[PDB]
Every structure is written in structure tokens, then in C-alpha cells.
Amino acid sequence: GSVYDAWFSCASNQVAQVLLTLPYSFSQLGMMSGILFQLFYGLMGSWTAYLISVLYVEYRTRKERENHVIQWFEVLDGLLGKHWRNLGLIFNCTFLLFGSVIQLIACASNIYYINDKLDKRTWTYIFGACCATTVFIPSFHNYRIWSFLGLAMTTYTSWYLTIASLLHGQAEDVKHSGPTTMVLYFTGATNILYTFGGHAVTVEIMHAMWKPQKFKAIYLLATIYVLTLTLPSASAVYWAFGDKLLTHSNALSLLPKTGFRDTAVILMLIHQFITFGFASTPLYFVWEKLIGVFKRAMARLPVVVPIWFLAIIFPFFGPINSAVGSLLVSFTVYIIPALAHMLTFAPAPSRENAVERPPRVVGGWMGTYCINIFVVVWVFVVGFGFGGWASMVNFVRQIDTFGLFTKCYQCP
Ligand SMILES: O=C(O)Cc1c[nH]c2ccccc12
């Protein structure tokens, strides 16, 4: 894969469905805090990808001096022993199970907005089967070169949301109460945390390059483009509708029904189904290996049954993003990538003999360790501590409001 091919991957593996939920998040944070968090986590999310990049280079160089595919649960094994391999494997697979569920919930939610004759829960049955057929495909890693399409699908939707909101225009009923409560505020901040970071598949992309060393720069440019997709779409939609978004998690529910809006759903539905096969093809690999194992394709289904159940019992499109973000992404994409870097380079011989030197601008090892400590401290307290509690108390509130196995979420 070429260097530019990866940039299409880091930009398509980024916001897929959360792009629709970001406007809902700002209604809980306010426009000011909303912009700052995306920039704040955008840089931290881009910084942790660098941490995953130096770790991968260190692993391969050590292993080459003493191969077809590498993954995160194996890089930790080589550097920090098998104890971290189990730690990384569980958190990644748990994030893929729920991360894959979010796609199924999003697909069912989006389709409802072009054909409302069937309720959203029923659409989870139809799309659940259309997402359970992923077991009948050997793998999607071989088709990671078509990521340029995913960027186009996300690019059009982001530019529609901002342009459509601006043309729609706000009205007298529109109000912007900003951070009304801490439960809502931290729930929104967790959606932005869930948005950025790398999504745990940042180590597989690097192995496809002719020169994996320069990935750290590519991701930063890939995150800068994402901010161009999220900052104007989320800021504009919030401006047009304001607090009305609080009861409308999906931005497409508020924008007027139009042929252009239909395109947003159709293009976005494809991008989420493919993103569903990208967040489940690793699950079908670990799962089959664990059980030892068309004789194989059908056997993958057991993994899908949890995806159906979670997607149907908790169709909470908006709040689920925060529930996954605070408990799993905060420990899978921010804290573990940061702890591993600190542990591996803790010994003096490893640090001095590091394959790649630390950045001069950051300030050498002293700067890198200080930043890594901040990442762990900030995400652990705000990302997991406050974010987890606020997300959970907001998540359970959905159960009271809409009930278990709700027929339809946040629809008229
Ligand atoms: O970032 C998101 O909205 C979710 C997402 C996009 N690509 C993914 C790959 C694996 C797991 C989750 C995601």
C-alpha cells in the first residue's frame, strides 16, 4: 500500500456514524466547549497514534534482528510480555463487539429516516441479517484499498450537514442553553473522546506501507482533515437547531426530508455496513482461533448473536457512543497505548537504544513521559472517571425513558 492509500484509511476508519451524533453532543457541551474538546482530543488522539507508531517500529525492528501480519495484541506481547497481550486482546475485542454493535444500531437508525414505514427496532432485524451475512466473507482486510470511497461518503455527509443547517436557518424557538448539567456535559465530552484516537486498528495500517516510519505524520494530516469534517458539521447543525438536538441524537432527524438527505443516508449506510465488516472481521479471526476452527463461515454466527441482542436491547444510538467511549475507548485507545510506551522504555538500555528517537519539539524523553502521564491522568479521571459515571447515569436514563427493547428510539 502506498503512503497516500493509508491516509484514505485513517480518514475513513475515523468518524463513520459519530459524525451524525456530534451535533447532539454539542447540545450537551455548548459550542465553545464542543470546539475545544475536538481540538483537545484531536491532538491527543493524534498523539497516541504516534505512541502506537513508535511501539510498532520498536517491535518489528527487535523481531527482524532476530512475517506477514502484526496486530496490537502481539506488539504488546513482544515488548511487555504475555500479561499485556491478554490485557490488549480483551480490551480490543470488547471494543470491537460494542463498536460493531454501534454500527448495527446506526444502520437501523439511518434507514428509518428514508423509509419510516417500519420501526427502527424492526430495521435492526432486517439489517441485523444483512450484517450477519458478514460471516459469509473470508475477510475484509484484503479490501482496505477501497477506503477512498469511504472518505467520499463521509465527506459528502459532513458537508451536507453544515450546508443544509445553514440553509435551514435558526428560528425564534431555537435556544442554546449550553452546559445545563454535569451529567450531560461529561456525556458529550465522552462522545468526542470516542470520536478520536485511532480505534485500535492503527497498528494494522502501518504494516501495509512501504515505509511505516512516516505514519506518525500521515495520521496528523488525517486527523486534521477529520476536524474539517466534524468542526463545521457539528457547529453548524447545533447553531441551526440548538437545544432541540438533545431529544434528537441523529442529526438527519431534524434536517428537512429531501433527495439530498436521502443520499446522505444511502451513502452513510454503505459506509457503516463496510465499517461493520471492518470492526468484526478481527472478531471472527480471534473467535475462530479460540475455538480451533461453508463449514467455517456459518460457525462465525455465534459471535453475531450478541451483536443482534445488544443492538436490539439497547438501540440507544446517541448515548451508547458515550457508554462505549468512557469504559472501553478510554482504556483501549488512550490509556493502554500510553502505559505501554512508558513501560517499554522505562529501562535505561531500552530508552537509550530506542530505534526511533523522541521528538525534539516535545522535549525528549522528559517531555514524552510528562505528556504520557497527562494522557493517562486526564483520560482516567475525565475520560473514565467522570465520563463513565455521567455516561452510565445518562445511559440508564434511556431505559426509564424508552424502556428495554424499545420499539423505536427518539422518533416522533
Ligand atoms: O469511529 C467510529 O465512529 C467507529 C469506528 C469506525 N471505524 C471503526 C473500526 C473499528 C471499530 C470502530 C470503528
Side-chain angles (χ1 to χ4, degrees):
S2 184
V3 176
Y4 303 120
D5 303 329
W7 183 88
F8 285 139
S9 302
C10 306
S12 58
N13 169 245
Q14 213 74 70
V15 298
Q17 54 79 46
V18 74
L19 186 77
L20 306 165
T21 302
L22 283 164
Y24 160 80
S25 194
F26 284 181
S27 76
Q28 298 178 177
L29 293 166
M31 182 144 58
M32 202 266 288
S33 297
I35 297 169
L36 268 288
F37 271 126
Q38 290 181 357
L39 301 172
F40 178 87
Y41 288 117
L43 292 164
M44 181 175 318
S46 187
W47 163 252
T48 292
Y50 161 85
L51 300 177
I52 295 162
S53 164
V54 67
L55 283 164
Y56 163 86
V57 168
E58 187 67 27
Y59 170 59
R60 181 164 171 172
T61 309
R62 294 172 169 185
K63 174 212 101 173
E64 266 190 48
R65 292 190 303 206
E66 303 161 335
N67 46 65
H68 274 324
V69 75
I70 297 144
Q71 293 194 340
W72 196 231
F73 86 91
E74 277 163 301
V75 170
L76 295 168
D77 188 58
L79 274 59
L80 308 174
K82 207 165 298 307
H83 295 285
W84 287 82
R85 174 263 187 188
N86 296 341
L87 187 79
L89 178 64
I90 286 166
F91 272 100
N92 283 317
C93 291
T94 295
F95 166 55
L96 270 69
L97 171 64
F98 284 95
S100 169
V101 165
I102 291 173
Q103 309 314 313
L104 175 51
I105 294 164
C107 286
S109 179
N110 282 314
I111 186 72
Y112 172 80
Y113 292 113
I114 74 182
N115 203 336
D116 69 41
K117 302 169 66 173
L118 281 73
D119 54 45
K120 297 166 82 170
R121 191 178 71 182
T122 293
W123 280 121
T124 310
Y125 303 161
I126 311 310
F127 264 82
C130 295
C131 295
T133 189
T134 298
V135 306
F136 294 140
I137 297 169
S139 66
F140 288 101
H141 292 89
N142 184 52
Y143 323 122
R144 194 141 211 181
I145 70 181
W146 266 267
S147 291
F148 73 86
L149 293 172
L151 190 66
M153 311 205 158
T154 312
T155 297
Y156 167 84
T157 306
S158 175
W159 283 134
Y160 181 76
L161 289 177
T162 190
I163 292 170
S165 300
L166 292 172
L167 295 172
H168 187 267
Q170 63 179 4
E172 179 60 21
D173 290 331
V174 176
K175 293 177 286 290
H176 306 88
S177 296
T180 54
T181 59
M182 291 325 138
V183 166
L184 294 176
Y185 185 83
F186 286 118
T187 297
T190 302
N191 283 329
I192 300 174
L193 180 147
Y194 170 91
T195 300
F196 292 102
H199 296 322
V201 74
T202 295
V203 70
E204 293 179 353
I205 287 166
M206 293 183 286
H207 188 57
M209 311 215 178
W210 318 128
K211 188 184 316 172
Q213 313 144 10
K214 57 167 58 183
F215 170 89
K216 59 182 68 72
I218 287 297
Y219 197 77
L220 182 64
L221 295 200
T223 300
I224 290 160
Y225 185 75
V226 169
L227 286 164
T228 300
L229 294 171
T230 54
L231 278 167
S233 71
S235 307
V237 176
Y238 178 51
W239 168 88
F241 299 104
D243 295 343
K244 195 83 191 163
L245 279 149
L246 287 167
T247 61
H248 294 94
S249 173
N250 191 327
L252 302 176
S253 71
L254 290 158
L255 292 165
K257 175 72 151 93
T258 307
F260 297 92
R261 203 189 90 172
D262 296 0
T263 301
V265 169
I266 298 144
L267 305 181
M268 192 56 107
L269 272 188
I270 294 160
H271 185 238
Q272 280 164 21
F273 169 68
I274 294 183
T275 294
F276 179 98
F278 274 31
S280 295
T281 187
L283 280 180
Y284 300 168
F285 187 71
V286 173
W287 164 249
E288 65 183 1
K289 292 267 201 176
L290 214 63
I291 188 74
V293 167
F294 182 76
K295 85 204 171 275
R296 192 263 311 281
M298 182 285 258
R300 288 157 151 180
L301 285 162
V303 177
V304 175
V305 162
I307 291 165
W308 291 353
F309 167 72
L310 301 165
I312 294 160
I313 190 167
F314 306 139
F316 309 151
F317 176 49
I320 196 163
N321 298 116
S322 176
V324 179
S326 45
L327 304 188
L328 302 177
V329 168
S330 83
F331 279 117
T332 300
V333 187
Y334 286 79
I335 290 169
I336 284 170
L339 289 169
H341 184 290
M342 294 190 315
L343 277 296
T344 195
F345 295 116
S350 186
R351 194 165 56 259
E352 187 172 37
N353 203 27
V355 171
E356 185 167 24
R357 304 311 311 310
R360 294 171 330 271
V361 63
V362 166
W365 294 109
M366 211 285 278
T368 293
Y369 268 73
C370 284
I371 293 174
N372 286 344
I373 288 163
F374 175 77
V375 160
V376 171
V377 167
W378 178 269
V379 174
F380 181 72
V381 182
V382 169
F384 165 61
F386 301 159
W389 161 84
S391 186
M392 282 312 116
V393 301
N394 186 74
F395 188 92
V396 298
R397 174 191 310 190
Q398 309 310 299
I399 303 289
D400 302 337
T401 307
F402 295 101
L404 208 68
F405 306 94
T406 193
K407 274 182 291 263
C408 182
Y409 183 70
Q410 289 180 355
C411 50

